[PDB]
């Protein structure tokens, strides 16, 4: 049987019922005990309403907005009898404002992104620095400094950000064993950072290759993806963004830093989904990824920062996304950027439309004595259908991470505002691994200088293959 | 009944029986009178041999090389009783050497590319300039200067290079007529160049969008295309190249000119099939094209050059390819450049494998009073199957162009070495148009500055939207 981890006696408030909400609700019903009538789904769309009604779940057809979120959500979060859980899987809503509302009213909180209120992403009066995920994350860090401790709110606990933070810790443990580095397993952030430094990890790619393909050819003027099209396009049009490692000797002319905050990131004055980087995964081998901004690019680099007494950073890894989405999404990007505007329509691939493929999602640690190491999941669509309904492999890696975060929050309900890097990674992977298919570690001798230089002059750094100067693709 | 244009009174030697040879053979058999035993195909491929046997045509399974071409081709082309025709549709053979051999022996000649002997494209001892199509074309121009007149040899007479030269002439005439400019169309090179100057044509894109889709999804580690994969990859890895207009006021730091030759071209120190440009076609609307090197980028800009009394160029249009290949080819390029090497296998889509689509191929004249004008063919796979066997829409545009050039060569057999810009464009389009489906001219308001600047700073020239500065896709 499937484990029922805990009883939830309070209200379960799910904000948003898109691809991730539809895959997460069945997991919540499977793994927690509660009266089904205590669950409530809020979503503005008719499509979501019909799906919730088909499940006999209470539904409120409203867009949560800055104007209504307090009057709308407080009664739902405080309905009792016990502590409620707010499961935020929406677009167009402020993660920070909803999280602070939940904590104000004693309700647990989890989300998979630091989302702003509608309008932020395309606000023409915002400076590029202000549109960065670094800046949005800094609003969460400030909230934590302002109100330490208290009710647990889990920020950015999906597949990536989320799970990959746990993969980094496991990968560091495996690397220490394989490199003969002795010592006890870290138990504090400082100890984790020092292990990464001692192992010589120069940087980390969130190295992903989605090979799911549809039973129909990509339609003209339709954006196709395996998860949120609105969310992927939004993050893809934000600046390319990365955690910036101490080993880097070069940044492009259009790179910029931040005057304040944790200090772990840079951004480029170009859209991340039109920025290519050289990377590698077990199934793809050498591939292009897109340098799409992601919270974990900053959070992981920040988490693994070592500082001296004066507080200056002496070690920090480079960390960023290196995303090869499904073929139809690759075509959708070429179409969107080539036309200069979003397609007229979009669709997310349903499991019934996917004929084969996997979502290979892992972390690539590089620069150490064994060059590069990839650790992560190779979950296939066939396995997904076997073990979880209403979602594809992309969705299941996300929904199962939300499940793990919820289990952790119930067992640690007064931990304050926390990121995935703050959770107990072993417990979270213990809950999530049944839904991840093959989880494997693979070494490779590939480097970004493989085969280079070619028949054209290239601006490369031959002294250190893994420099960003060698990873970034110029156009 | 199909028209029979001419009797060929000698041997027909077709070098190469790939996608284009297979599409051109039925048109030769359809439109020319000759004894069946006069035609012979030469190709080293076993796949090619079996198809030729099924077609009942003489086949010699041999690679033409520097070492054997004289011993092989001279007897075959001079078998008599009269003038033969060398129809060169191969890869890895020297167009120049074979052309000069055919001419030395009184045989007509046609090809669709200035191909070099095997080894040239990837010779590591060659500078990028020496690997350019500008340089290859200059060998043909020098051969013409050294031996003017003589037997007709048609260089680069496919769809593009080839047919698009005739489209440029027709487009110019249409542009003038659409402005109410009546009277004598030009008859000399200098008059054509002045028509383009007088109408204010700043530049020309060879603006192509292939929408042919396969009945099977893109296989991993397989390069898929609708015509020669080897030929497309070769030119895709040559330097980006363009005819360079007098109106341009900016070029990239890695752009280079030529010390010698006609003077009409620049090249970039980067591969063309990984260089993107902003362009437009009627069915695609705004799209990315790849800036792949092509003979006609130089020959058209050269043809349309106006010089002053001293001999200095005072007007010349920009001209280059803006190629959006079929979706599987787009994915194949992303795969190839992302891995840094050619896929292990490749395949060309057969008409039986194509579910739908067109090859939209035309010329986009811009900078004139009506901004932009696209003229060309919208041939669909469905129409192709009705009018010509053994090829897709891509192949038929090419094979019908070779048919037209062969007709022109037979009708003008003492014209010496000629390019597509040298032929009677009306007669050539008269022969080819039955195979081009819809041939239309479409005006558009679109410019490369549409929607720009976006939310990031960009280096653009707002006073002149069609400047290469605005067309080239840069970081
Ligand atoms: N961390 C990760 O790994 C990860 C992965 C995928 C998605 N995500 C994020 O999770 C979120 C959900 O993804 P998805 O795929 O389900 O998206 P989706 O687009 O499928 O669904 C979004 C849903 O939000 C609803 N919505 C829109 N405006 C709203 C409002 N004002 N209030 C409430 N609901 C509103 C829509 O009606 C829609 O059903 C997105 O923000 C996405 O960026 C994270
Ligand atoms: N101008 C245009 O519009 C245009 C369009 C398409 C192709 N082309 C060119 O036409 C040519 C043919 O294209 P394709 O699609 O048929 O290519 P293809 O790859 O299908 O076929 C090429 C053929 O050449 C043969 N070959 C290889 N080496 C040879 C040798 N030494 N001697 C004789 N034959 C040899 C191969 O066996 C093969 O059958 C290529 O050079 C291509 O670049 C021009």
Q: Where are the domains of chain B?
A: 1-157+403-423, 158-402+424-475
Give dist(CA A59, CA A76) in Å, integer: 12
Identity of the residue in A217, A339, A455 whose CB atom sits nearest the CB atom of B285 = A339
Could A239 and B213 be called an inter-chain contact, meaning their C-beta atoms sit closer than 8 Å? Answer: no
C-alpha distances in Å from residue A323, one per residue of A238, A301, A448: 15, 18, 15
Q: What is the atom index within ligand 2 of the atom nearest the CA of B230? A: 19
Q: Measured between alpha carbons, how far is A105 from A97 in angstroms, rounded to an integer? A: 13
Beta strands at B358-366 and B372-380: parallel, antiparallel or unpaired:
antiparallel
* B25, B48, B227, B325, best to mutate for ligand 2 pocket (most atoms within 8 Å of CB): B227
Residue among B202, B169, B190, B216 nearest B441 (CA): B169
Measured CA to CA, the distance from residue B83 to residue B10 in angstroms comes to: 5
Identify the nearest ligand to the CA of B154 by its number: 2
Angle at B166 between CA B165 and CA B170, to 5 degrees: 120
- Residues A153 and A109 sit within 8 Å (Cβ to Cβ): yes
Residue with the smallest CA separation from ligand 2 atom 9 is B112
Question: Best substitution site from B63, B98, B228 to test ligand 2's pocket, by max atoms within 8 Å of Cβ?
Answer: B228
Token pair for A15: 């904000």
The residue nearest atom 27 of ligand 1, judged by CA position, is A91
At A287, which helix (H) or strand (E)?
Answer: strand A285-290
Q: This structure's resolution (angstroms)? A: 1.9
Strands B306-307 and B313-315: antiparallel
Residues sharing a CB contact under 8 Å with residue B324, sequence separation 6 or more, in sequence order = A338, B208, B209, B210, B279, B281, B284, B287, B288, B289, B290, B330
Q: A58-60 and A203-210 as β-strands: parallel, antiparallel, unpaired?
A: unpaired
Beta-carbon count within 10 A of B445 CB: 8
**Tokens read off for A212:** 């799911």
φ/ψ of B342, rounded to 5, equals -65, 140
Phi-psi region of A400 (alpha: psi -120 to 50; beta: other; left: phi over 0): alpha
HSE-CB of B123 using CA atoms within 13 angstroms: 14
A115 lines ligand 1 (CB under 6 A): yes
| Whole-angstrom distance, CA of residue B228 vs CA of residue B48 | 14
Of residues B406, B413, B442, the one with CA closest to residue B427: B406
Residues B255 and B266: their CA atoms lie apart, in Å, by 7
Do A450 and B340 count as a contact with CB atoms less than 8 A apart? Answer: yes
Cβ contacts of residue A396 below 8 Å, gap of 6+? A23, A379, A384, A387, A388, A435
Q: Which two tokens stand for residue B152?
A: 């007709």
3-state secondary structure at position B151 = coil
Q: Does domain B1-157+403-423 have CATH number 3.30.70.360?
A: no
CA proximity to A439, closest of A370, A375, A381: A375
Please give the structure tokens belonging to residue B77.
Answer: 């082309």
Q: Do A217 and B220 touch (CB under 8 A)?
A: no
Compute CA A258 distance to the chain's CA centroid, rounded to the nearest angstrom. 22
Q: Look at the block and give the residue holding tokens 């497309």.
A: B232
| Contact (CB, 8 A) for A209 and A324 | yes
**CA B15/CA B97 separation, integer angstroms:** 13
For residue B427, the SS3 value is helix
Sign of the Cα torsion B189, B195, B201, B206 reads negative
Helices (H), B260-363: 295-303, 327-339
Radius of gyration of chain B (CA): 21
Question: Which 3 state secondary structure label does DSSP give B88?
Answer: strand
User: How far apart, in whole angstroms, are the C-alpha atoms of residue B189 and residue B418?
Assistant: 13
Place of tokens 């939004």: A234
Residue that the structure tokens 């051109």 belong to? B24
Q: Report the run of H or E that residue A430 belongs to, with start and end.
A: helix A425-432
Q: Is CATH 3.30.360.30 what the domain over A158-402+424-475 is classified as, yes or no?
A: yes
Buried b (16+ CB within 10 A) or exposed e, B76-87: bbeeeeebbbbb
Residues of B in contact with A215 (CB under 8 A): none
Q: A197 - beta bridge partners? A: none
By C-alpha distance, which of A318, A284, A278 is closest to A451? A278
The number of CA neighbours under 13 Å toward the Cβ of A410 is 25
Q: At what angle do helices A393-411 and A163-178 cross, to 10 degrees?
A: 90
Residues in CB range of B403: below 8 A, 6 or more apart: B24, B27, B28, B31, B431, B432, B435
B356 forms beta bridges with B213
3-state secondary structure of B165: helix
Q: Which of A190, A147, A95, A159 is nearest to A414 (CA)?
A: A147
3-state secondary structure at position A373: strand
CA A231–ligand 1 middle distance (angstroms): 7
């Amino acid at each position: 049987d499937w484990p029922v981890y805990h009883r939830i006696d309070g209200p379960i408030v799910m904000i948003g019922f898109g691809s991730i909400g539809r895959g997460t609700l069945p997991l919540i019903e499977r793994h927690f005990a509660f009266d089904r009538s205590k669950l409530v789904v809020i979503d503005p769309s008719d499509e979501a309403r019909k799906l919730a009604e088909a499940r006999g779940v209470r539904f409120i057809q409203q867009a949560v907005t800055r104007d209504n979120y307090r009057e709308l959500l407080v009664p739902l979060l405080t309905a009792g009898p016990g502590q409620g859980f707010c499961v935020n899987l929406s677009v167009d809503t402020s993660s920070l404002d909803i999280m602070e509302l939940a904590r104000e009213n004693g309700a647990l909180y989890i989300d998979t992104v630091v989302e702003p209120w509608l309008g932020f992403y395309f606000d023409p009066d915002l400076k590029p620095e202000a549109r960065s995920n670094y800046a949005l994350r800094e609003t969460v860090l400030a909230a934590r400094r302002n109100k330490p401790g208290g009710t647990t709110a889990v920020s950015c606990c999906g597949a990536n950000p989320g799970m990959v933070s746990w993969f980094v810790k496991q990968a560091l443990v495996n690397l220490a064993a394989d490199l003969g580095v002795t010592g006890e397993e870290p138990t504090t952030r400082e100890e984790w950072a020092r292990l990464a430094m001692d192992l010589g990890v120069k940087g980390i790619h969130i190295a992903e290759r989605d090979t799911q393909r549809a039973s129909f050819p990509k339609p003209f003027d339709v954006f196709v993806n395996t998860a949120s099209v609105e969310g992927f396009v939004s993050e893809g049009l934000q600046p390319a963004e990365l955690g910036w490692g101490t080993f880097e000797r070069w940044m492009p002319d259009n790179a910029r830093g931040h005057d304040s905050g944790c200090g772990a990131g840079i951004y480029l004055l170009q859209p991340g989904a039109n920025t290519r980087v050289r990377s590698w995964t077990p199934t793809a081998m050498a591939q292009y990824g897109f340098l799409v901004t992601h919270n974990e690019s900053i959070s992981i680099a920040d988490f693994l920062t070592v500082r001296d007494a004066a507080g200056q950073a002496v070690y920090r890894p480079t960390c960023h996304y290196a995303y090869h989405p499904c073929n139809d999404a690759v075509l959708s990007l070429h179409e969107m950027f080539g036309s200069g505007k979003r397609q007229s329509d979009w669709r997310i691939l349903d499991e019934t439309e996917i004929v084969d493929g996997i979502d290979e999602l892992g972390v690539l640690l590089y620069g150490h004595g064994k060059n590069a190491y990839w650790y992560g999941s190779q979950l296939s669509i066939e396995e997904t259908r076997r073990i979880a309904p209403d979602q594809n492999a992309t969705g299941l890696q996300v929904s199962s991470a939300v499940l793990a975060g919820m289990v952790w929050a119930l067992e640690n309900p007064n931990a304050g505002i926390v990121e995935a890097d703050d959770l107990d990674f072993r417990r979270c992977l213990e809950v999530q691994t049944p839904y991840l298919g093959p989880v494997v570690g693979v070494y490779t001798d590939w480097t970004p200088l493989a085969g280079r230089p070619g028949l054209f002059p290239e601006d490369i750094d031959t002294s250190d293959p893994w420099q960003f100067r060698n990873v970034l693709v110029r156009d």
